[PDB]
Design brief:
homodimer, alpha+beta, Bifunctional nuclease domain, eight-stranded mixed beta sheet, binds chloride ion, nuclease activity (chain A)
């Protein structure tokens, strides 16, 4: 009931001067745009550069917390939209082990995408969001 | 070892107009200023305000991950300074020495302490070498 997606670009909405994630939807030529805050966009911009920093930023520290508790990002789902807000699930995998070892966590789309970018974990978008909110470019 | 601290104040430096966290060192009249980024300062402000939001911000997400994995923030330690950089430890307690030391920036660790109520500690080296002892005249200037 959901399509694989990826970060195509992090654009700027020069009208609202705000960052816009453009998710590609696999199986389509449509994209789903998601508006995020400035600090979120900066963190995603840095994550997508995939470069080395001498000190852990917040999402890095999240990922270190997961690692320490023998878990990892399994996937990310952008599933719902109400009142201009997309709702995401960070699906975490408990590595103490069999598929019921997945934990769903409420997340904003920004945080989820950033963690998926950092980890290589898959992003999914629900059919319904694609049907109703994906766009052509 | 180390001294208990609390966030006395978060403000924009009145010259560089960037955030500085003044930590108070309990049991003293000393404070430790730590300069942080614009985004970290906003996150800390929201946390200090105990701002209630419909959606989880990044630090909230981290704390829900902790909770999901049966763990809590235990305490936070600002322990070293190297080339203008403070180094911290996020100490996590596995609720299932079940304590875990995780390297942190001071910003993140102070944010997570403020949100959870976990104690902030500063090492005696930092206090001895970097804290400053305020006179009332200097506290009034900050206030
Ligand atoms: Cl978001
Ligand atoms: Cl910092």
């Amino acid at each position: 009931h959901m399509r694989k997606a990826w970060v195509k670009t992090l654009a700027l909405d020069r009208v609202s001067n705000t960052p816009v994630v453009i998710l590609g939807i696999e199986g389509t030529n449509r994209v789903l745009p998601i508006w995020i805050g400035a600090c979120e966009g900066h963190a995603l911009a840095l994550a997508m550069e995939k470069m080395e920093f001498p000190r852990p930023l917040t999402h890095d520290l999240l990922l270190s917390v997961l690692e320490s508790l023998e878990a990892r990002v399994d996937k990310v789902i952008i599933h719902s939209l109400k009142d201009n807000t997309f709702y995401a699930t960070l699906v975490i995998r408990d590595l103490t082990y069999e598929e019921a070892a997945l934990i769903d966590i409420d997340s904003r789309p920004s945080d989820a995408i950033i963690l998926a970018v950092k980890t290589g974990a898959p992003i999914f978008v629900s059919d319904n969001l694609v049907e109703k909110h994906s766009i052509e470019l």
